[PDB]
Write a protein that binds this ligand. Structure first.
Ligand SMILES: CCn1c(NCc2ccco2)nc2ccccc21
Length: 487
């Protein structure tokens, strides 16, 4: 790493200086490092230039705004300081070059939208790896090679991706936040493909409002290397995107493919939601097929079909994707199904707000021939507002509501429960069982063979906070034990 080589595309005159690490933070700036001084949210890194120089940085790249011309090379206390205008916009490219263009050294797939990012990225990484890639994810769980995912500027993004390349990754599925995009955090990434899941941005109901928002997004889009575009045609904004992108792949499970366009497409033609997942028949421009998904709910059919269409688009063979689909797993504690021969279907989900709970119940209902049970509670010593709302949701969208504890902390457990019940039209028909373990047991053992028991609120977590203590407790382990299986 050399300053001169780093800057060659932009500043031909730049001096030659060995560089160690690249950093935005003058505090962490070590000897031999490259300090980048950017202007941000009430904050000017340029004021920390003397600090970093005293900490022994090898060189500095600084925002030229008001202070210098673009590409002006100065020298303070020996150390070269180079000014670039619109540095925030160019940071991703600068960092890309610094870390030897990590997105050119693996297949990077970006997933954006309100919901389904985590699952869709997870499925992409899994499926690609099943087909022989070494796959990684960068998302809100964390970053890492599949199974080794550890829990954030444009530099950090390029640095993390470079780390994954170094660890041997050939494929990376990255969640892309709308916040990230607008702030140029992925501006210079070479995406092999870009997936759009959906949009639940309200405050867009005017055609004076909707227009600046869309215009801003179209512009940004035109500035990114998006690669192959894969778009959910069951979303209204999805169809607007598709109207203007003839090379994009449309994906649908609800009849929104317009085959007149002669584009690439993929649609589910029938889905049977059963007690251990979903059976999905689809047609596509790559040919037809049938998948057994071990994921629950309609949204997860959609996510799976997006992952499939993306991989097909990138040239992974249909036959191999089909042969491997059955090994695709849910994200731990996200509509995670537990079945055992001759027992009720049990689903562990982390849903802990009214919205999430409603979605999880609706999803579970599709798979439920019998009664749908909902085992849940609400956090103690936290905001109380959601309690009666979650109560009303359980009452409406389930047949049996079992109200129990969920991290009651220092608050009286029964007080929390009373707050939940107050939300119901007929609290008297709700079952209350204190001791979360006992409540789960009550549902699992009373439910019929074709009932579905949703156990909501904890998902992957392995603790129940009672008082000051984190006791060892898992919904997954509790369920697994009761059904005579492994978690
Ligand atoms: C990183 C890709 N990306 C997306 N989402 C996925 C998509 C939309 C249309 C096809 O795929 N929306 C964007 C907006 C501006 C820049 C880039 C964007």
């Amino acid at each position: 790493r050399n300053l001169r080589d780093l800057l060659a595309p932009w500043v031909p005159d730049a001096p030659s200086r060995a560089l160690r690490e690249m950093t935005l933070d003058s505090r962490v700036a070590a000897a031999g490092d490259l300090f980048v001084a950017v202007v941000g949210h009430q904050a000017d890194g340029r004021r920390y230039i003397p600090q970093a120089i005293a900490q022994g940085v090898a060189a500095i790249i600084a925002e030229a705004k008001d202070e210098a011309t673009d590409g002006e090379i100065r020298e303070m206390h020996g150390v070269p300081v180079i000014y670039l205008s619109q540095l925030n916009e160019r940071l991703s490219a600068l960092a890309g070059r610094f870390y030897h263009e990590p997105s050119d050294n693996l297949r990077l797939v970006g997933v954006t939208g309100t919901n389904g990012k985590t699952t869709t990225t997870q499925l992409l990484a899994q499926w690609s790896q099943l087909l022989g890639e070494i796959s990684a994810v960068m998302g809100t769980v964390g970053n890492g090679l599949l199974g080794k995912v550890i829990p954030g500027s444009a530099v950090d993004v390029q640095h993390e991706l470079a780390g994954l390349v170094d660890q041997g990754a050939t494929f990376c599925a990255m969640e892309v936040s709308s916040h990230g995009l607008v702030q140029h955090r992925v501006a210079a990434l070479k995406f092999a493909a870009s997936v759009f899941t959906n949009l639940s941005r309200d405050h867009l109901d005017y055609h004076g409002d909707m227009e600046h928002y869309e215009a801003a997004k179209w512009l940004l889009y035109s500035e990114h290397h998006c690669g192959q575009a894969i778009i959910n045609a069951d979303d209204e904004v999805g169809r607007r995107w598709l109207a203007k992108l003839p090379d994009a792949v449309a994906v649908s499970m609800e009849d929104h493919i317009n085959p007149n366009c002669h584009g690439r497409w993929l649609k589910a033609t029938e889905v049977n939601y059963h007690d251990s997942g979903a059976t999905i028949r689809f047609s596509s421009s790559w040919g037809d097929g049938e998948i057994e998904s071990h994921l629950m709910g309609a949204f997860n059919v959609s996510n799976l079909l997006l992952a499939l269409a993306t991989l097909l688009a990138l040239g992974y063979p249909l036959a191999d994707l089909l042969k491997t689909a059955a090994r695709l797993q849910p994200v731990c504690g996200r509509m995670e199904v537990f079945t055992a021969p001759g027992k009720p279907t049990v689903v562990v989900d982390y849903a802990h707000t009214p919205d999430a709970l409603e979605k999880a119940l609706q999803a579970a209902r599709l798979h439920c021939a019998g009664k749908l049970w909902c085992v849940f509670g609400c956090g103690g010593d936290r905001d109380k507002g959601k309690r009666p709302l979650m109560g009303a949701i359980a009452e409406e969208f389930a047949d049996v509501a079992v109200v129990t504890d969920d991290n009651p902390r220092t608050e009286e457990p029964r007080a929390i429960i009373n707050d939940i019940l107050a939300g119901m039209l007929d609290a008297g028909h709700a079952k209350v069982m204190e001791g979360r373990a006992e409540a789960v047991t009550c549902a699992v053992m009373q439910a019929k063979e074709n009932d579905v028991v949703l156990v909501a609120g904890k998902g992957h977590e392995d603790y129940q906070i009672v008082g000051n203590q984190r006791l060892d407790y898992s919904d997954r382990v509790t369920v697994a034990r009761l059904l005579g299986v492994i978690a």
